[PDB]
Ligand binder design. Structure first.
Ligand SMILES: Nc1ncc(Cl)c2sccc12
Length: 331
Protein backbone atom coordinates (compact mmCIF):
# COMPACT_ATOMS: atom_id res chain seq x y z
CA UNK A 1 0.00 0.00 0.00
CA UNK A 2 1.48 3.46 -1.11
CA UNK A 3 0.51 7.21 -0.95
CA UNK A 4 -2.18 8.17 -3.55
CA UNK A 5 -4.08 4.78 -3.76
CA UNK A 6 -7.92 5.13 -4.26
CA UNK A 7 -10.12 2.29 -2.75
CA UNK A 8 -13.62 1.59 -4.28
CA UNK A 9 -14.43 5.30 -5.09
CA UNK A 10 -14.47 6.37 -1.33
CA UNK A 11 -11.12 6.26 0.65
CA UNK A 12 -7.83 8.04 -0.34
CA UNK A 13 -4.74 6.65 1.62
CA UNK A 14 -2.28 9.29 3.05
CA UNK A 15 0.31 7.53 5.34
CA UNK A 16 1.14 4.89 8.03
CA UNK A 17 0.26 5.89 11.66
CA UNK A 18 1.18 2.61 13.46
CA UNK A 19 2.36 -1.02 12.95
CA UNK A 20 1.38 -3.94 15.27
CA UNK A 21 1.16 -7.75 15.71
CA UNK A 22 -2.30 -7.74 13.96
CA UNK A 23 -1.08 -5.62 10.97
CA UNK A 24 -1.15 -1.90 9.98
CA UNK A 25 -3.13 1.30 10.74
CA UNK A 26 -3.37 4.20 8.18
CA UNK A 27 -4.50 7.83 7.70
CA UNK A 28 -7.16 8.10 4.90
CA UNK A 29 -9.78 10.70 3.68
CA UNK A 30 -13.49 9.67 3.35
CA UNK A 31 -15.38 11.52 0.55
CA UNK A 32 -18.99 10.67 1.60
CA UNK A 33 -18.72 11.95 5.23
CA UNK A 34 -15.90 14.34 4.14
CA UNK A 35 -13.67 13.84 7.25
CA UNK A 36 -10.33 12.13 8.07
CA UNK A 37 -10.50 8.57 9.52
CA UNK A 38 -8.03 5.87 10.78
CA UNK A 39 -8.14 2.41 9.06
CA UNK A 40 -6.73 -0.75 10.84
CA UNK A 41 -5.84 -3.57 8.29
CA UNK A 42 -5.50 -7.26 9.56
CA UNK A 43 -2.60 -9.51 8.11
CA UNK A 44 -3.88 -12.11 5.47
CA UNK A 45 -3.73 -15.43 7.52
CA UNK A 46 -6.32 -17.82 9.09
CA UNK A 47 -5.12 -16.84 12.63
CA UNK A 48 -5.36 -13.02 13.09
CA UNK A 49 -8.77 -13.00 11.22
CA UNK A 50 -10.61 -15.28 13.74
CA UNK A 51 -9.51 -13.05 16.69
CA UNK A 52 -10.36 -9.83 14.66
CA UNK A 53 -13.94 -11.22 14.05
CA UNK A 54 -14.33 -11.37 17.88
CA UNK A 55 -12.90 -7.79 18.25
CA UNK A 56 -15.64 -6.51 15.81
CA UNK A 57 -18.51 -8.44 17.54
CA UNK A 58 -17.48 -6.99 20.97
CA UNK A 59 -17.28 -3.38 19.60
CA UNK A 60 -20.77 -3.58 17.78
CA UNK A 61 -22.36 -5.07 21.00
CA UNK A 62 -21.17 -1.83 22.76
CA UNK A 63 -22.55 0.61 20.02
CA UNK A 64 -26.13 -0.74 20.79
CA UNK A 65 -26.21 0.84 24.38
CA UNK A 66 -26.63 4.66 24.61
CA UNK A 67 -25.81 5.62 28.24
CA UNK A 68 -23.87 8.70 29.54
CA UNK A 69 -20.88 6.34 30.32
CA UNK A 70 -19.98 4.87 26.88
CA UNK A 71 -18.09 8.03 25.77
CA UNK A 72 -14.66 6.95 27.13
CA UNK A 73 -14.25 4.23 24.39
CA UNK A 74 -13.02 4.72 20.75
CA UNK A 75 -15.94 4.83 18.25
CA UNK A 76 -16.06 2.17 15.49
CA UNK A 77 -17.78 3.48 12.32
CA UNK A 78 -17.66 0.66 9.70
CA UNK A 79 -16.04 -2.67 8.60
CA UNK A 80 -15.71 -4.45 5.20
CA UNK A 81 -13.47 -6.94 3.24
CA UNK A 82 -11.04 -5.96 0.42
CA UNK A 83 -8.22 -7.92 -1.41
CA UNK A 84 -8.95 -10.62 1.34
CA UNK A 85 -8.07 -8.46 4.41
CA UNK A 86 -10.66 -7.51 7.16
CA UNK A 87 -10.64 -3.65 7.54
CA UNK A 88 -12.06 -1.65 10.54
CA UNK A 89 -12.70 2.19 10.39
CA UNK A 90 -12.45 4.44 13.52
CA UNK A 91 -12.46 8.21 14.34
CA UNK A 92 -9.01 9.95 14.40
CA UNK A 93 -7.40 10.65 17.86
CA UNK A 94 -4.05 12.24 19.05
CA UNK A 95 -0.85 10.82 20.75
CA UNK A 96 -0.86 8.31 23.70
CA UNK A 97 0.04 8.70 27.48
CA UNK A 98 3.50 7.04 26.93
CA UNK A 99 4.63 9.79 24.45
CA UNK A 100 3.27 12.26 27.07
CA UNK A 101 5.47 10.69 29.82
CA UNK A 102 8.52 10.72 27.39
CA UNK A 103 8.07 14.53 26.73
CA UNK A 104 8.63 15.20 30.56
CA UNK A 105 11.96 13.22 30.34
CA UNK A 106 10.17 10.71 32.69
CA UNK A 107 9.72 13.29 35.53
CA UNK A 108 5.86 12.77 35.52
CA UNK A 109 2.65 14.94 35.34
CA UNK A 110 0.95 16.81 38.31
CA UNK A 111 -1.33 15.21 40.98
CA UNK A 112 -4.20 17.43 39.68
CA UNK A 113 -3.79 16.06 36.08
CA UNK A 114 -3.30 12.48 37.46
CA UNK A 115 -6.70 12.86 39.27
CA UNK A 116 -8.47 13.89 35.98
CA UNK A 117 -7.07 10.78 34.16
CA UNK A 118 -8.16 8.37 37.02
CA UNK A 119 -11.77 9.81 37.17
CA UNK A 120 -12.34 9.32 33.38
CA UNK A 121 -10.87 5.70 33.52
CA UNK A 122 -12.94 4.48 36.54
CA UNK A 123 -16.05 5.53 34.48
CA UNK A 124 -15.02 3.36 31.45
CA UNK A 125 -14.53 0.27 33.76
CA UNK A 126 -18.05 0.85 35.27
CA UNK A 127 -19.50 0.81 31.66
CA UNK A 128 -17.89 -2.62 30.81
CA UNK A 129 -19.39 -3.98 34.14
CA UNK A 130 -22.89 -3.74 32.52
CA UNK A 131 -24.36 -7.24 33.14
CA UNK A 132 -25.59 -7.53 29.50
CA UNK A 133 -21.94 -6.62 28.43
CA UNK A 134 -19.43 -8.05 31.02
CA UNK A 135 -16.20 -7.33 28.99
CA UNK A 136 -12.50 -7.75 30.15
CA UNK A 137 -9.92 -5.59 28.21
CA UNK A 138 -6.90 -7.86 29.15
CA UNK A 139 -4.19 -5.32 27.84
CA UNK A 140 -4.42 -1.94 29.74
CA UNK A 141 -1.19 0.19 29.69
CA UNK A 142 -0.08 3.76 28.71
CA UNK A 143 0.33 2.89 24.96
CA UNK A 144 -3.40 1.86 24.72
CA UNK A 145 -4.79 5.27 26.14
CA UNK A 146 -5.02 8.31 23.68
CA UNK A 147 -5.75 12.09 23.99
CA UNK A 148 -8.93 13.21 22.07
CA UNK A 149 -7.31 16.60 21.05
CA UNK A 150 -3.65 17.72 21.60
CA UNK A 151 -4.82 21.00 23.32
CA UNK A 152 -7.05 19.09 25.94
CA UNK A 153 -7.01 16.40 28.76
CA UNK A 154 -9.93 14.18 27.53
CA UNK A 155 -8.89 10.49 26.87
CA UNK A 156 -10.26 7.23 25.27
CA UNK A 157 -9.26 3.49 25.36
CA UNK A 158 -8.32 1.36 22.19
CA UNK A 159 -6.92 -2.13 21.13
CA UNK A 160 -9.74 -4.63 21.90
CA UNK A 161 -7.50 -7.31 20.24
CA UNK A 162 -7.19 -9.45 23.47
CA UNK A 163 -10.71 -8.74 24.91
CA UNK A 164 -13.18 -11.48 26.03
CA UNK A 165 -16.63 -11.81 27.78
CA UNK A 166 -16.89 -13.32 31.31
CA UNK A 167 -16.75 -17.17 30.94
CA UNK A 168 -15.40 -17.14 27.28
CA UNK A 169 -11.58 -17.35 28.19
CA UNK A 170 -9.27 -18.70 25.37
CA UNK A 171 -5.70 -18.26 26.77
CA UNK A 172 -4.14 -18.27 30.30
CA UNK A 173 -1.01 -16.21 29.40
CA UNK A 174 -2.60 -12.78 28.96
CA UNK A 175 -1.69 -9.09 29.86
CA UNK A 176 1.67 -7.14 29.51
CA UNK A 177 4.25 -8.38 32.11
CA UNK A 178 4.62 -4.98 33.99
CA UNK A 179 0.77 -4.72 34.35
CA UNK A 180 0.03 -8.51 34.95
CA UNK A 181 -2.10 -9.32 38.10
CA UNK A 182 -1.19 -11.93 40.84
CA UNK A 183 -4.07 -14.39 39.95
CA UNK A 184 -2.81 -14.66 36.28
CA UNK A 185 0.82 -15.18 37.58
CA UNK A 186 -0.51 -18.05 39.83
CA UNK A 187 -2.42 -19.64 36.86
CA UNK A 188 -5.94 -19.18 38.42
CA UNK A 189 -9.10 -18.31 36.42
CA UNK A 190 -9.79 -14.57 35.86
CA UNK A 191 -12.82 -12.17 36.00
CA UNK A 192 -13.12 -8.32 35.47
CA UNK A 193 -10.91 -7.42 38.55
CA UNK A 194 -7.60 -7.89 36.63
CA UNK A 195 -8.23 -4.57 34.71
CA UNK A 196 -8.52 -2.65 38.08
CA UNK A 197 -5.10 -4.07 39.21
CA UNK A 198 -3.55 -2.65 35.92
CA UNK A 199 -5.11 0.84 36.58
CA UNK A 200 -3.39 1.08 40.02
CA UNK A 201 0.00 0.30 38.44
CA UNK A 202 -0.62 2.85 35.59
CA UNK A 203 -1.72 5.85 37.84
CA UNK A 204 1.34 5.70 40.23
CA UNK A 205 3.70 5.69 37.12
CA UNK A 206 2.03 8.77 35.53
CA UNK A 207 3.05 10.86 38.61
CA UNK A 208 6.59 9.35 39.31
CA UNK A 209 7.66 8.90 35.63
CA UNK A 210 8.87 5.22 36.02
CA UNK A 211 6.92 1.90 36.29
CA UNK A 212 5.86 0.54 39.77
CA UNK A 213 6.79 -3.21 39.08
CA UNK A 214 9.34 -3.62 36.18
CA UNK A 215 10.05 -7.39 36.00
CA UNK A 216 12.41 -8.92 33.37
CA UNK A 217 10.55 -12.31 33.70
CA UNK A 218 7.62 -13.95 35.62
CA UNK A 219 9.79 -14.89 38.72
CA UNK A 220 11.43 -11.36 38.79
CA UNK A 221 7.95 -9.69 38.52
CA UNK A 222 6.45 -11.49 41.58
CA UNK A 223 9.54 -10.68 43.76
CA UNK A 224 9.23 -6.88 43.01
CA UNK A 225 5.56 -7.15 44.22
CA UNK A 226 6.39 -9.00 47.52
CA UNK A 227 9.00 -6.18 48.21
CA UNK A 228 6.07 -3.68 48.56
CA UNK A 229 2.99 -5.75 49.64
CA UNK A 230 4.54 -8.82 51.43
CA UNK A 231 3.56 -12.53 51.23
CA UNK A 232 0.01 -13.20 49.91
CA UNK A 233 -2.89 -14.53 52.07
CA UNK A 234 -2.57 -18.31 52.77
CA UNK A 235 -6.21 -19.11 51.73
CA UNK A 236 -5.25 -17.85 48.19
CA UNK A 237 -1.98 -19.86 47.63
CA UNK A 238 -3.78 -23.09 48.74
CA UNK A 239 -6.00 -22.94 45.57
CA UNK A 240 -3.36 -21.59 43.10
CA UNK A 241 -1.93 -24.20 40.65
CA UNK A 242 1.48 -22.42 40.22
CA UNK A 243 2.01 -21.40 43.87
CA UNK A 244 5.16 -23.65 44.05
CA UNK A 245 6.85 -21.69 41.18
CA UNK A 246 7.39 -18.84 43.75
CA UNK A 247 6.73 -20.19 47.38
CA UNK A 248 7.02 -23.24 49.82
CA UNK A 249 4.47 -24.69 52.42
CA UNK A 250 5.64 -25.30 56.07
CA UNK A 251 4.67 -28.09 58.55
CA UNK A 252 2.42 -25.69 60.64
CA UNK A 253 0.99 -24.40 57.27
CA UNK A 254 2.64 -20.96 56.59
CA UNK A 255 4.33 -19.97 53.24
CA UNK A 256 7.73 -18.29 52.48
CA UNK A 257 9.65 -17.20 49.37
CA UNK A 258 11.92 -19.80 47.65
CA UNK A 259 15.83 -19.94 47.53
CA UNK A 260 17.90 -17.97 44.82
CA UNK A 261 21.67 -17.56 43.94
CA UNK A 262 22.31 -13.94 45.18
CA UNK A 263 22.85 -8.29 44.49
CA UNK A 264 19.04 -7.50 44.94
CA UNK A 265 15.57 -7.90 46.73
CA UNK A 266 14.67 -6.19 50.13
CA UNK A 267 12.64 -8.06 52.80
CA UNK A 268 8.86 -8.64 52.27
CA UNK A 269 6.62 -5.55 52.75
CA UNK A 270 9.52 -3.14 53.62
CA UNK A 271 9.47 -0.99 50.38
CA UNK A 272 6.47 1.08 51.68
CA UNK A 273 4.53 3.07 49.01
CA UNK A 274 4.77 5.90 51.66
CA UNK A 275 8.33 6.76 50.31
CA UNK A 276 7.65 5.82 46.62
CA UNK A 277 5.20 8.80 46.51
CA UNK A 278 7.26 11.08 48.89
CA UNK A 279 4.13 11.94 51.00
CA UNK A 280 5.82 13.65 54.04
CA UNK A 281 9.00 14.55 51.95
CA UNK A 282 7.53 16.91 49.26
CA UNK A 283 6.63 14.44 46.42
CA UNK A 284 8.82 12.19 44.18
CA UNK A 285 12.50 13.32 44.54
CA UNK A 286 10.89 16.14 46.60
CA UNK A 287 10.42 17.89 43.16
CA UNK A 288 7.02 19.38 44.22
CA UNK A 289 7.71 20.94 47.69
CA UNK A 290 6.83 24.61 46.76
CA UNK A 291 4.05 23.51 44.31
CA UNK A 292 0.43 24.06 45.58
CA UNK A 293 -2.16 21.23 45.46
CA UNK A 294 0.55 18.75 46.65
CA UNK A 295 -0.27 19.10 50.44
CA UNK A 296 0.24 16.07 52.83
CA UNK A 297 -3.59 15.75 53.40
CA UNK A 298 -4.17 15.27 49.58
CA UNK A 299 -1.28 12.69 49.41
CA UNK A 300 -2.87 10.35 52.03
CA UNK A 301 -6.12 10.17 49.96
CA UNK A 302 -4.10 9.08 46.84
CA UNK A 303 -2.16 6.45 48.96
CA UNK A 304 -5.42 5.02 50.44
CA UNK A 305 -7.15 4.65 46.99
CA UNK A 306 -4.07 3.00 45.25
CA UNK A 307 -3.83 0.41 48.09
CA UNK A 308 -7.53 -0.54 47.60
CA UNK A 309 -6.73 -1.23 43.87
CA UNK A 310 -3.67 -3.53 44.83
CA UNK A 311 -5.58 -6.01 47.14
CA UNK A 312 -4.37 -9.64 46.56
CA UNK A 313 -7.95 -11.01 47.10
CA UNK A 314 -9.95 -10.21 43.91
CA UNK A 315 -13.33 -10.90 45.64
CA UNK A 316 -12.59 -8.01 48.13
CA UNK A 317 -10.75 -5.59 45.69
CA UNK A 318 -12.47 -2.17 45.02
CA UNK A 319 -14.98 -1.89 42.06
CA UNK A 320 -15.59 1.01 39.57
CA UNK A 321 -18.72 2.56 41.29
CA UNK A 322 -17.29 2.62 44.89
CA UNK A 323 -13.95 4.10 43.57
CA UNK A 324 -15.84 7.09 41.93
CA UNK A 325 -17.20 7.85 45.52
CA UNK A 326 -13.72 7.97 47.21
CA UNK A 327 -12.59 11.03 49.26
CA UNK A 328 -9.84 11.70 46.62
CA UNK A 329 -12.54 12.77 44.09
CA UNK A 330 -14.36 14.95 46.73
CA UNK A 331 -14.34 18.79 46.29
N1 LIG B 1 -4.70 8.30 15.74
C1 LIG B 1 -5.36 7.17 15.98
N2 LIG B 1 -6.71 7.26 16.11
C2 LIG B 1 -7.44 6.16 16.36
C3 LIG B 1 -6.87 4.91 16.53
CL1 LIG B 1 -7.87 3.53 16.89
C4 LIG B 1 -5.49 4.79 16.42
S1 LIG B 1 -4.52 3.36 16.57
C5 LIG B 1 -3.10 4.25 16.16
C6 LIG B 1 -3.31 5.58 16.06
C7 LIG B 1 -4.72 5.92 16.14
Amino acid sequence: VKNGEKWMDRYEIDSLIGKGSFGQVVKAYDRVEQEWVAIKIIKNKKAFLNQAQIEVRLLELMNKHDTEMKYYIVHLKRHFMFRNHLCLVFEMLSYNLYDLLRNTNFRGVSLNLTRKFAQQMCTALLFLATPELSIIHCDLKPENILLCNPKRSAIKIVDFGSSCQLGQRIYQYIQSRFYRSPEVLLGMPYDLAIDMWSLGCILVEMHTGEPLFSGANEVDQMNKIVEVLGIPPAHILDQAPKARKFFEKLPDGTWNLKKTKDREYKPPGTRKLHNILGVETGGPGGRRAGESGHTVADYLKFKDLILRMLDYDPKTRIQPYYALQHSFFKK
